[PDB]
Each structure stands twice: as structure tokens, then as C-alpha cells.
Design a protein around this motif. Sequence first.
Motif, PDB file in Angstrom:
ATOM      1  N   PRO A   1      65.542 -73.348  47.770  1.00 54.13           N
ATOM      2  CA  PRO A   1      64.398 -72.761  47.067  1.00 54.13           C
ATOM      3  C   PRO A   1      64.718 -71.719  45.993  1.00 54.13           C
ATOM      4  O   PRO A   1      63.825 -70.990  45.560  1.00 54.13           O
ATOM      5  CB  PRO A   1      63.606 -72.128  48.222  1.00 54.13           C
ATOM      6  N   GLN A   2      65.987 -71.657  45.567  1.00 60.09           N
ATOM      7  CA  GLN A   2      66.430 -70.737  44.529  1.00 60.09           C
ATOM      8  C   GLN A   2      67.102 -71.525  43.406  1.00 60.09           C
ATOM      9  O   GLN A   2      67.692 -72.577  43.647  1.00 60.09           O
ATOM     10  CB  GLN A   2      67.383 -69.687  45.107  1.00 60.09           C
ATOM     11  N   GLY A   3      67.009 -70.999  42.181  1.00 63.56           N
ATOM     12  CA  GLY A   3      67.608 -71.636  41.020  1.00 63.56           C
ATOM     13  C   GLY A   3      68.092 -70.610  40.001  1.00 63.56           C
ATOM     14  O   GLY A   3      67.436 -69.590  39.786  1.00 63.56           O
ATOM     15  N   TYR A   4      69.246 -70.897  39.388  1.00 64.51           N
ATOM     16  CA  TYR A   4      69.762 -70.076  38.306  1.00 64.51           C
ATOM     17  C   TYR A   4      69.324 -70.677  36.975  1.00 64.51           C
ATOM     18  O   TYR A   4      69.577 -71.851  36.715  1.00 64.51           O
ATOM     19  CB  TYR A   4      71.280 -69.907  38.420  1.00 64.51           C
ATOM     20  N   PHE A   5      68.653 -69.859  36.154  1.00 70.13           N
ATOM     21  CA  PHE A   5      68.007 -70.327  34.937  1.00 70.13           C
ATOM     22  C   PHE A   5      68.774 -69.865  33.702  1.00 70.13           C
ATOM     23  O   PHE A   5      69.034 -68.673  33.530  1.00 70.13           O
ATOM     24  CB  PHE A   5      66.558 -69.839  34.865  1.00 70.13           C
ATOM     25  N   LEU A   6      69.122 -70.836  32.850  1.00 71.12           N
ATOM     26  CA  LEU A   6      69.690 -70.574  31.537  1.00 71.12           C
ATOM     27  C   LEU A   6      68.809 -71.238  30.483  1.00 71.12           C
ATOM     28  O   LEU A   6      68.336 -72.357  30.681  1.00 71.12           O
ATOM     29  CB  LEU A   6      71.125 -71.114  31.457  1.00 71.12           C
ATOM     30  N   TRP A   7      68.603 -70.526  29.369  1.00 69.61           N
ATOM     31  CA  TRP A   7      67.810 -71.019  28.255  1.00 69.61           C
ATOM     32  C   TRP A   7      68.569 -70.793  26.952  1.00 69.61           C
ATOM     33  O   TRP A   7      68.863 -69.653  26.595  1.00 69.61           O
ATOM     34  CB  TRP A   7      66.433 -70.345  28.236  1.00 69.61           C
ATOM     35  N   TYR A   8      68.877 -71.893  26.258  1.00 63.91           N
ATOM     36  CA  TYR A   8      69.562 -71.846  24.977  1.00 63.91           C
ATOM     37  C   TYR A   8      68.622 -72.332  23.878  1.00 63.91           C
ATOM     38  O   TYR A   8      67.962 -73.358  24.033  1.00 63.91           O
ATOM     39  CB  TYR A   8      70.800 -72.746  24.986  1.00 63.91           C
ATOM     40  N   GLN A   9      68.556 -71.570  22.780  1.00 61.63           N
ATOM     41  CA  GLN A   9      68.004 -72.084  21.538  1.00 61.63           C
ATOM     42  C   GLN A   9      69.163 -72.579  20.680  1.00 61.63           C
ATOM     43  O   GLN A   9      70.080 -71.818  20.370  1.00 61.63           O
ATOM     44  CB  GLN A   9      67.159 -71.043  20.803  1.00 61.63           C
ATOM     45  N   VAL A  10      69.099 -73.861  20.316  1.00 61.21           N
ATOM     46  CA  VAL A  10      70.188 -74.517  19.615  1.00 61.21           C
ATOM     47  C   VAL A  10      69.626 -75.257  18.403  1.00 61.21           C
ATOM     48  O   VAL A  10      68.435 -75.555  18.346  1.00 61.21           O
ATOM     49  CB  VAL A  10      70.977 -75.438  20.570  1.00 61.21           C
ATOM     50  N   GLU A  11      70.507 -75.534  17.438  1.00 64.35           N
ATOM     51  CA  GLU A  11      70.192 -76.300  16.247  1.00 64.35           C
ATOM     52  C   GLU A  11      71.308 -77.326  16.073  1.00 64.35           C
ATOM     53  O   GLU A  11      72.479 -76.956  15.978  1.00 64.35           O
ATOM     54  CB  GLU A  11      70.020 -75.335  15.070  1.00 64.35           C
TER      55      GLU A  11
END
Lengths: 69, 119, 88, 279, 101
Positions: free
Chosen positions: E56-66
Motif C-alpha cells: 500500500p505504499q509507492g515511491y513517486f517520481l515526476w519528470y517533465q521532459v522534451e
Amino acid sequence: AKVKATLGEFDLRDYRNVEVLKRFLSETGKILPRRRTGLSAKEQRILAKTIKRARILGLLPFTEKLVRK
Amino acid sequence: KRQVASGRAYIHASYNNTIVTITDPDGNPITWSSGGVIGYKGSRKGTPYAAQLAALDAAKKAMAYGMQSVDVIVRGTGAGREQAIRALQASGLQVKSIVDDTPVPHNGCRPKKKFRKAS
Amino acid sequence: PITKEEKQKVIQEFARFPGDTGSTEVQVALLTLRINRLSEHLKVHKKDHHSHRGLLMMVGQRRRLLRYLQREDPERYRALIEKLGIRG
Amino acid sequence: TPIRTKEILKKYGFQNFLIDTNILNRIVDHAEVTEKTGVIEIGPGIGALTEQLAKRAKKVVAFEIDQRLLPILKDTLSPYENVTVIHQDVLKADVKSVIEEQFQDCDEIMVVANLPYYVTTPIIMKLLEEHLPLKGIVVMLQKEVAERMAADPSSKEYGSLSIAVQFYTEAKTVMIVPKTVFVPQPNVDSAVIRLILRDGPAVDVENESFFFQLIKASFAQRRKTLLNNLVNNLPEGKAQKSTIEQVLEETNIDGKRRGESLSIEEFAALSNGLYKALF
Amino acid sequence: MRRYEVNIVLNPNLDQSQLALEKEIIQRALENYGARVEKVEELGLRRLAYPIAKDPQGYFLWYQVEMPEDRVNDLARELRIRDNVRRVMVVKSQEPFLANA
RNA sequence: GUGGGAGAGGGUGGUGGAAUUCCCGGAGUAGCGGUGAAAUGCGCAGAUACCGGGAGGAACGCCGAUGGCGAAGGCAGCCACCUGGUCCACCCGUGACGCUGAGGCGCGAAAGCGUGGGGAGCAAACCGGAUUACCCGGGUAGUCCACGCCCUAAACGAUGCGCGCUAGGUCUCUGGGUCUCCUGGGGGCCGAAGCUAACGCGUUAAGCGCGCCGCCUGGGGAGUACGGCCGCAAGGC
RNA sequence: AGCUGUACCGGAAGGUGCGGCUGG
């Protein structure tokens, strides 16, 4: 009342802003109609899309249990 | 025997029957009863009175195994729903939570002919 | 998709005079570009029956424009048809 | 009788009726019953057919299964003497004994019946199954079914009933009954057919069981290649595929032929072919 | 040659070493496909509304890419192969439609 | 041409959860299921109800609408790519380049067919149970995928396509502006003049006109017969 | 409540399966 009225300014396309998105779901994890949310159709469409997206990311519940009779 | 003293109850409410299953926190059932166990046969099993007696019987058995309080979960939308809840409420067990857990498809398998025609 | 750059270069190549964007030559060239792209797409995607209609309409429009151009001034028609490699 | 029907029903406090007269004579005209031929009727009902039949019948036996209609059979058939009612279900009875008993003095019998269609076909099939020595049968049996009984080997009628009857008897549509003649309009057309029995089977009697089994197999998926039908429906037959391919060659029947387009002769040939070759 | 957002939800029960290795490998794979990072956002740990891979746990990564368009699918197919990464979602960078203002 | 907009429009890849079935493990015992009421059926080789893990197929709940898109058929989880149509503003370019269209060519729900996969649920034929159909329990084709056929309908708004003119009121989807309002394009109701045998239609005409195509000539026999073309066949024209 | 295209019907006075229509 209305969910929109019971809220400040926010973005509809933000599929990570859980604290505001949860306001648009019923007791059970279901999308509220325009009757309740008080949005225009375009707004409702965008909101539903975002809700589904967040659901996939696991941030919002697909279904849950109502704690009543 | 088990002497768990605190479990939960699953009320499977159907249009034809009502079945009450008492269980430990772990989900392993300890005792169960239905409309048929009381002695009713055919349509009589579907009556709310049958649901009441089923709930009372299951509760009495669960008490005999030493429970004191449960957390009731109800499934289905049969005719014995509210009656079973009420019966179990005043049976002597200290019910804490009532939870609706009706399992519905997300437009999955095609239903039987009698249940089709739905828009 | 056809980027603005691709369109612009075609417009500025086929223009009669600078700032021209609407002559028959320019229209024919743009339709040719679209037709080539769509033909490639349909060659890949065989069961895209909905885009084939688009292709037929485009081809029809190009043929109508070419008919008009040929009727008006044959020389420009010949030059355009050879330079675009239409019907060859 | 249209005028008399109401009187008779009302006089007792009281279902499809041949109220009209001329055609009830025509059906027995086609049936060809004389002082030489007796009649077994299974659907006498009120006895409308029985009266005009016994007007020119040698012997009349009638089967009534419901005793509610029994009290009115006697008094409506008072003048006639040929009438003999056996209150027995023909399916559950033994028609052989009745043939040996009642018509011992009489010469010949040709069954003429008018009964509900949901009862019709099983009765005809039974009367054919047990090889009774009777001349013929005449029944009006929901025209759409009668065509299937005759059913030239094509045109959506040639099924499995066709093969059975043509293996047992001859069949041909005799008369068309125009709708609405019955007081309640039945929203459907009926036809009088006649069956005439034969001396022995039409074709080889090699194996009745296997013959009928093959008939059933070839018509399971009607819209299907005969080879596909056999590889599917015939027991196993998956591992025996090559055997089927072999046998179809020497029978001069093509694999892709849609068995609905076969003749009784061809079916008999195939029945002989597969048997003693399949196993 | 478009702007995308890449969301990675991966195993939360990774220590410093494993998490660093996973970040490094996904970064290398991202750079491998002609992608250029505009920004990175690390949201860390969140409470999933339902279990994913029983956890029930998650490690979150968010990338803005071009990056080039014709590569994007492949990139996802590349990023979904590790057993540590649970969810990978690539979405076209849209505009913040503002209402109730 | 430039700038922008909405959308279950189409194709190809890829993954998300709910639910049914089945297999394994645990716990527990006498019914479960089904009906108007019952029966067939399943269950002491442990069924039903419960918890955990796994396999597979098909469909995408809430939003969801009297909504949207497409030429029709038809099209709903989500992401990405490729791609068709269309609307608006600016009024910038060409200067009648237009409309319709016998043949031709393409598309064409469902049900069917062929060659290979697949098969969870439902379910023609069929098999059993009650009571003539109905209803109940099983069950093959089929429903799903790839390729190739078939080409039909209450394929309907029973209304061919294009253009112009003739009061308005109200609801709604989607653009623009000088945003109480004004100006475009769709979808609905009520109604001027008018039309209609009547019902009703009425700026989305069935009103008034122009152009082009298709079709009708009393019912049954009959979409039958023969002929021709197409199809593996059913059958189609 | 009917009607309809297609496909079956060895308890067809007609029934059923898959879709469509309101001409209920």
C-alpha cells in the motif's frame, strides 16, 4: 450546496492534486454528477478524464465501502 | 474453543435466501447459519423472518464460542438485509460498524437473459 | 503531421509572386503533399477505411483543380505536372 | 357446422374447428376410404370429421385421451353405429393389438387425424417406427412442417424428418387449407398431407442406429461443410479425420458439399461406407 | 518534438543504495532516447488508495521532459521492464485549464 | 493562407481495476440453488457463505445527459503514435475553378461461410424438470482474434443532394466580440404565413422556387417462374 | 405488445438465438 462553491480556485487538469480531487468523489469512490459538482459540461468532461487518470496512478480509489446501514 | 471474543459477520443477502457467516478477524469462518438451517424450505427461506432467525441462530452459536462483539459486513440486496442487521444488532453482540460491500461488475461478464434488457 | 516549416517551404517554392498563397499551383502542391503522406499512412494501415474517404476527396479536388488549370493555360499545367511528377 | 357449433357448445356450458363442410369431404376424398377401408382417427374432437367420415366409412375407431370430451361423443354420434371409442393414448397404447382385434373382419385401414401440432409429429413418428401393417396416414400438420416432411433435397426444408419419412414411407403435400376457416384465426396456414407405407426400407437396412446417427451428425450445424460437420459432431472423428477424407472419395461425395444437399441414396451409401471402415 | 510528463511509481521498500541505483538507471534510459529533462519533482512516499503489488505504499517520481514523439512508446516499454518499477505513465504536457476564478 | 477550438471519428501498439468461472491453500458443516409455488441439478469424495494466492477470456460501472462525432453502417477504461472530417476569427491569396451524377470503384449492423487460433459468461439446435407456449437446470454452433468471403433490415427522420427567400419564443452543445447583450455552427420542443385527405410539417419544411439523379401506374399470384451476372453455400442483384 | 434481416427447430395452431424499429 455545490462542490465548486465549496472550493477555492484550482486546476482541473492536475492529475496529482488529490486533496481537491477527493472532493468530487462520493462516499463510495464514484464521480459525482453535475447536479452535485456544479460544473459546466466541458469542466465535467475534463474533471472525469483527470479523475480516471488519477485512479490509474493509484491516488484515488476505484471503489470503496460506505459505512452505513 | 477459539475464544476470539471479537470477530466479524458476513451477511450474504439474496432474493432466495440469507446466509450469515461469523468469522475471526483473520477471515476464517467460525460458525454459520442460513434460512434453510432453521427449517424453512422453498420461498419461505427468502422471508425477512427467516433472515432474523438466521442472524439470531448464528449469533447464539458465535457466543457459544465466546465472542462479545463483531463488525458486520452486508453483501447483496435481498429481502432480509435490514431485518438481519436489526436482529444481529439486539442479539447481545456489541456491533461496532455496519459496512455495505455489494460486489457489482464494472460492465464485465454478460448477465443471464432474465437480468438483461438493462439500458 | 505536416509541420509549418514543410508547408511554408512548399508555399514559398510554388508561389507565382512573393506573398502568393492561393494560386492554383500552390493548392495543387499542398494537396499533393497531403496525398503523399496519406498514401504512406494507408499503405501501412490497410483497415483504416475512414481515412480512405479523405484520400478519395483529396484526389478528386486535385483533379478538378488540374482540369481548370489545363483549360485556362496549358503551359503552366504542363510545367506543374512535370515538376510535381503527377500522372507519370 | 358453424351454426350448430354454438348450439352444441352452449348446450353443455362450453380449440380449433373445421366448421366448414365441403373441405372435410375433400380431405377424405384424398384419403380414399370406402366400405373396403376402415379408419383410425386419433383427433376426433367434437366428432365433426367423424360424422362425414362414417357417412362412407367401413369401420370407425376413435382415440380420445380426455374424458371431459367423452360425455359428448356418444350423443353427438348417436345415429352412427360404426363408432368405437378407445379412451387410450395412442403413444402409450399398442396399436398392433387394436389392428388385430377391431379390424379383423374389416379389410384395410388408413389413419385420418386432426390434432394439435405439438402432438402431431411424435405420433406420426411412432406410427412409422413400429412397422404397423396399415395402408396410409392423412393429417393436416402445420404446412411449414408438411413441406419439411416432403422436402425435395434442397430449399431450406430438407432436414432430418424428410430422410426418416422417405426412409419409411412416401410423402407429398395433398391440400392447402386457407386460413380463417377456423372460428379463431390461427395466424398460420395448414396443409393436409398423406403418407403411404412401403414394403421394407427405402434403402439398405445395414445399420438403423448408425444410419440415423449419421443423419443427426450431418445436420447439427446445417450451415456448414459436410466434412466439418463430421469432424465435429460424429463421435471423436478428430483423430479419424483422414479416414473420413478417404471414405468420401470412393463414395463420390465431395467434402465441401453442405450435407443438406444430399439424397437418401447418397446417405445410405455413406452409412454403409463409414460403418465397417470407421470401426 | 514534444513535451511529456513521465510518472514513475516504484517499490517504496528500497534503501538509499537501491533507490539511488534505480533513479540512476531510469535517468540513463531516459537520456538514451534523445530526451531532455526540463525539471524533476520528487514527491517521495504517498498512501495508495488501493494496494499495488500487495504493497500500500509507492515511491513517486515526476519528470517533465522534451523528446521526439516517435520514440515515446519505446521509452515506456524500456521503463516498464524493471521489477522495482510498478507504474509508468507518459502523458502529453497539456495546459492548466482554470475554472472557478 | 495565418491563428485558434470541440469531439465514444478510424487504425496500430501498450496496460488498469471491478466482476463471473476454474485450480491450489486455510477455516468450517449440512444444506445450496431455483420458482408464482416446486422440481431437475450440485453437495458428507465436504457443497453454499469466508480469507489468501494463481490462470484465462470477454466487457469497460460512476461521469452519462433529451449529450458528442461520422456519409451511412456505427462509435464509450486509460496512455502514446499515425490519420480523416469539421467550426470560428482575420477578410490575406486565386478569380466561376460550381451543382448533380446512368455506369464504374469503395464502404456496409447483425446473422451466416472458409482457413488457423481462442473459449470466462451467455446461448439457437439438443438434453433433462415442472406446467400447450411460457418458466427452471444443463449445452454444441455462435458470440472473441487474424486473413478471405457474404452484402441483407423497421439499413428509418419509412423524408435523395445543392442553393436562395419566408414571424418568432424557449432549452441545450460548441467558437468569437465592444460580454445585461450581440454575432456564427450543430442538436431538441412550441408556434406566423403557408402546405396537407387528415394526422401533422413549419429557417433542421412536408412552405415558395431553380438544377440533377432514383423510383411509382389496382390487389393476389410473386420477389415466384425462366434467362443473365455474382457467391464455396445459404443466397444476392 | 408487435413487426423485421438472418440461422435453426424429430412437444411449430408457431418457438427460440443474435441485432434493429415503434408502425405499442
